[PDB]
Amino acid sequence: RDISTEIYQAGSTPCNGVKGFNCYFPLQSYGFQPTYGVGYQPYRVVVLSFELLHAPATVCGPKKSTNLVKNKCVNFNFNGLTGTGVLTESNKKFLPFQQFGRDIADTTDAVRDPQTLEILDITPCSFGGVSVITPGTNTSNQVAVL
Amino acid sequence: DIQMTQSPSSLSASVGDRVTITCRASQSVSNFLHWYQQKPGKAPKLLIYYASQSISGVPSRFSGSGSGTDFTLTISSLQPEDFATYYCQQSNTWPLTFGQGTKLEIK
Amino acid sequence: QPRTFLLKYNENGTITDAVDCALDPLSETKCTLKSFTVEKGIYQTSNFRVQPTESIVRFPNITNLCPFGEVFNATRFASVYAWNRKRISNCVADYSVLYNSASFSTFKCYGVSPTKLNDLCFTNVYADSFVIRGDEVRQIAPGQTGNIADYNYKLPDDFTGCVIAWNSNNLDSKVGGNYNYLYRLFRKSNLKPFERDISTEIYQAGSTPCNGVKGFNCYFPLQSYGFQPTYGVGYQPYRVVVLSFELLHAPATVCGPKKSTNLVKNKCVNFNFNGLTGTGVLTESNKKFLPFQQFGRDIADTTDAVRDPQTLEILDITPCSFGGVSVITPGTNTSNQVAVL
Amino acid sequence: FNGLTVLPPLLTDEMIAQYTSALLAGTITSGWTFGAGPALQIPFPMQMA
Amino acid sequence: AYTNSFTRGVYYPDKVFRSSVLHSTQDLFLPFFSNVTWFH
Amino acid sequence: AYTNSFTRGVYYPDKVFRSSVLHSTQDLFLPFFSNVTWFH
Amino acid sequence: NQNAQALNTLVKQLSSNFGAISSVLNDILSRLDPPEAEVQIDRLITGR
Amino acid sequence: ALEPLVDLPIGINITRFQTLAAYYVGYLQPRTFLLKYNENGTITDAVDCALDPLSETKCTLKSFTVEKGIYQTSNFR
Amino acid sequence: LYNSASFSTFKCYGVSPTKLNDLCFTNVYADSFVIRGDEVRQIAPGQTG
Ligand SMILES: *[C@@H]1O[C@H](CO)[C@@H](O[C@@H]2O[C@H](CO)[C@@H](O[C@@H]3O[C@H](CO)[C@@H](O)[C@H](O)[C@@H]3O)[C@H](O)[C@H]2NC(C)=O)[C@H](O)[C@H]1NC(C)=O
Ligand SMILES: *[C@@H]1O[C@H](CO)[C@@H](O)[C@H](O)[C@H]1NC(C)=O
Ligand SMILES: *[C@@H]1O[C@H](CO)[C@@H](O)[C@H](O)[C@H]1NC(C)=O
Ligand SMILES: *[C@@H]1O[C@H](CO)[C@@H](O)[C@H](O)[C@H]1NC(C)=O
Ligand SMILES: *[C@@H]1O[C@H](CO)[C@@H](O)[C@H](O)[C@H]1NC(C)=O
């Protein structure tokens, strides 16, 4: 915010206090009349600047809460943090200023919950490639699956 | 700011001859130039104004012509009592600039 | 201070030890190796380069200055019926002498900003000049209509240019009236922008055409201002020099001034030669340039030499010395003393 | 050029030649016994024999 | 009076848990072995 | 009349100093051994 | 010859525009705004 | 090698021309040239890359002396 | 805020307009001022004036 009222110097010689020769006052007025057009009308701007996670999350929405379930593959939403995994008990003793734990390469490892402050661990759900043992279609269609 | 020059600097003349002195401007003064005459110990007087026209009340032994950046007058009948330093004066741009002088001398 | 640390966390979840990345090259090696224990050998930690100490700006010398003295400093400004258009081109136009002096009070440059004017490259400047009444400041503007706008001289709706004008009372006012300056009240056509109606026809209003005589409902449009020094500021002489601009039709030939900077040799500088920029060490050369060439390039399009403006010297561009920073260490068991290559 | 450096080799050109002169002197003097253990000299007709 | 800062001035960066990981961050830290000003 | 243009008609394309180097450029040029038309 | 020609190709690909208005980074910063000069720089970054 | 003299920013469209006892009028076409620069900076010899396939090998290899062998220089379509 | 038809210039970059309640934001900087009528374009990231 530039609230200062120092006069602007343009051409050559600094006046330093007198509005005059090459010395214009920086704060000039709108001067709104209702006879003006829509490109001259007032416009009450209210801009809502966010940052997306410089801080712990404080401004949530009006969506209803959901009861928690233990040791199952769920799609959780931890104050805007959307992810998948199972939610198990954890023995990681956090200091009370942490709100979430972070793993290697921008993946979230442990989150403490809203309304309860009980610590949870995020482990991803069980995945893996599938593989087929076959003797060939010329011999038999019996398939072992790995 | 107009570098106003004239050639020749010191030229001689005789009785009753036809002399031609020119005076040149750096920038275009196309139709506004005045011609003066100055005897020693005497204030000048207009001779030719706007490089073509002449003042009423001057002896018409001379006439002036020229445009662009080349200006002159021709004295068709010179007399020995002149011997004076001739001056040009433009009228186009500030500041107003004179010439150095063409002093006429008798042999 | 904005430093970079390397924190070691624990099985508790607490910080045990740390190093500073900018303290010494040993902990710089610990930062770039991401461990507290370095082994015996050589490691490249960072890149060293010589910074530009100061910059030099170079541009060709101004020997072709634009005729702004012929359009501002003139004895006879032509009137608005015979407003004088001069095309200003093939030179360098200085608007800083215009903006830095305040004989005027009414800049109001529509389109381009009044401040940033010497940097933009225009192509064609139309310097018009006319003298109007003192209260007609609002009429010379895009969009505004009236006598001076509609029937005298129209500025266009998308006008890009400055409306430079000073209100002079000493020069163009004669005691008794300067009747040389003239304007039109009555005209049967709204003038399109950049048009010049010098015709002296008789205006017919009511019923019957006069056609050569003057009388009842037949007004001569050519009427005098009649400037007097005892008038107010709305009736004072008002000397206008309006400058029209590019309108995207030509290549650029009229530009703003460019301040030259004195060169220093054998140092790492950030140079600018005729629009070609770069960072390097300038030194003398024995390479014979042909007289039309401005800069020389080596193998694979790297500028090896440049011809110096304003003195016709040939300067060799050597890039500033750079290399990786190598740290000799015996290992953290042996010693903490390091050597830097 | 910009961003390009050429690292010098650790073994120089006058000193790779010292290895080749050492291998030549060891070969001509001793056959192949310097490649096996200690350098045992031999006359060169007996070596070529 | 002036004192060496030694190896003090180390804090937690961004209120986030991390365990047994050599982590590099760039924040406003106190430099090691710098001069602090002593008032008594 | 017509004449073969031989190897004439080569200008400096870019006003750049170049030394001991083979340079390939793509501007408008007169082709070698083309028909140049002879007038009187 | 292969090493010097690979280095000469590596220097010679700095002159490529990669679809941008010019290949000189200071030239495309000196006359353009930041958030279109961003995508003009980014083409040169991914090409080089 | 023909040196430049002037560069005039006129920006007017030119389509036909006329000349004020004998002269040659040739026409320019957008073809690639290989230019040999001397140590002083002047052009010593030049090679038109669209004249014959020997000059296509010269413009491909960027040399005025080609060695013995086979060179893939262009594509027939 | 979204269902109020008094506004005509909601005009939201960053987070998309239609899914806005579902995220939980941390710091919301509700600034407020009054400007000249055709200066809608200058309050935008990048457009200058
Ligand atoms: C149009 O005319 C004006 C007025 O003559 C020019 O403005 C500058 O005015 C000042 C004083 O009025 C003068 O500056 C002089 O500079 C010299 C050298 O520094 C100094 O020795 C003198 O004592 C004096 O201060 C001079 O008339 C003029 N300055 C110049 C020409 O550099 C104005 O430049 C003219 N041209 C335009 C395009 O406006
Ligand atoms: C299928 O297998 C049998 C014996 O293994 C073989 O004789 C036969 O040729 C095979 N079929 C084909 C199409 O190769
Ligand atoms: C806490 O720190 C101690 C000290 O090294 C460590 O032995 C222990 O494993 C940590 N964790 C717990 C849960 O006590
Ligand atoms: C020092 O050496 C010992 C064995 O010689 C090793 O166990 C120890 O880890 C080393 N210290 C380090 C790498 O900090
Ligand atoms: C280069 O120019 C110098 C002086 O003009 C001359 O002596 C020399 O022979 C030239 N080198 C050539 C033509 O290879």
From Swiss-Prot, chain A:
Residues 1-25, 54-76 are annotated as: Disordered. Disulfide bonds join 15-23, 73-125. Changing residue 21 to P: In strain: Omicron/XBB.1.5, Omicron/EG.5.1. Glycans are attached at residue 138. It comes from the Viruses. Changing residue 28 to R: In strain: Omicron/BA.1, Omicron/BA.2, Omicron/BA.2.12.1. Changing residue 82 to K: In strain: Omicron/BA.1. Binds to host ACE2. RBD also interacts with the N-linked glycan on 'Asn-90' of ACE2. Cleavage of S generates a polybasic C-terminal sequence on S1 that binds to host Neuropilin-1 (NRP1) and Neuropilin-2 (NRP2) receptors. Interacts with host integrin alpha-5/beta-1 (ITGA5:ITGB1) and with ACE2 in complex with integrin alpha-5/beta-1 (ITGA5:ITGB1). May interact via cytoplasmic c-terminus with M protein. May interact (via N-terminus) with host bilirubin and biliverdin, thereby preventing antibody binding to the SARS-CoV-2 spike NTD via an allosteric mechanism. Attaches the virion to the cell membrane by interacting with host receptor, initiating the infection. The major receptor is host ACE2. When S2/S2' has been cleaved, binding to the receptor triggers direct fusion at the cell membrane. When S2/S2' has not been cleaved, binding to the receptor results in internalization of the virus by endocytosis using host TFRC and GRM2 and leading to fusion of the virion membrane with the host endosomal membrane. Alternatively, may use NRP1/NRP2 and integrin as entry receptors. This is Spike protein S1. It comes from Severe acute respiratory syndrome coronavirus 2. The gene is S.
Swiss-Prot record, chain I:
Residues 36-38 are annotated as: Integrin-binding motif. It comes from the Viruses. Changing residue 4 to F: In strain: Omicron/BA.2, Omicron/BA.2.12.1, Omicron/BA.2.75, Omicron/BA.4, Omicron/BA.5, Omicron/BQ.1.1, Omicron/XBB.1.5, Omicron/EG.5.1. Attaches the virion to the cell membrane by interacting with host receptor, initiating the infection. The major receptor is host ACE2. When S2/S2' has been cleaved, binding to the receptor triggers direct fusion at the cell membrane. When S2/S2' has not been cleaved, binding to the receptor results in internalization of the virus by endocytosis using host TFRC and GRM2 and leading to fusion of the virion membrane with the host endosomal membrane. Alternatively, may use NRP1/NRP2 and integrin as entry receptors. Binds to host ACE2. RBD also interacts with the N-linked glycan on 'Asn-90' of ACE2. Cleavage of S generates a polybasic C-terminal sequence on S1 that binds to host Neuropilin-1 (NRP1) and Neuropilin-2 (NRP2) receptors. Interacts with host integrin alpha-5/beta-1 (ITGA5:ITGB1) and with ACE2 in complex with integrin alpha-5/beta-1 (ITGA5:ITGB1). May interact via cytoplasmic c-terminus with M protein. May interact (via N-terminus) with host bilirubin and biliverdin, thereby preventing antibody binding to the SARS-CoV-2 spike NTD via an allosteric mechanism. This is Spike protein S1. It comes from Severe acute respiratory syndrome coronavirus 2. The chain holds residues 368 to 416 of 1273 of the full protein.
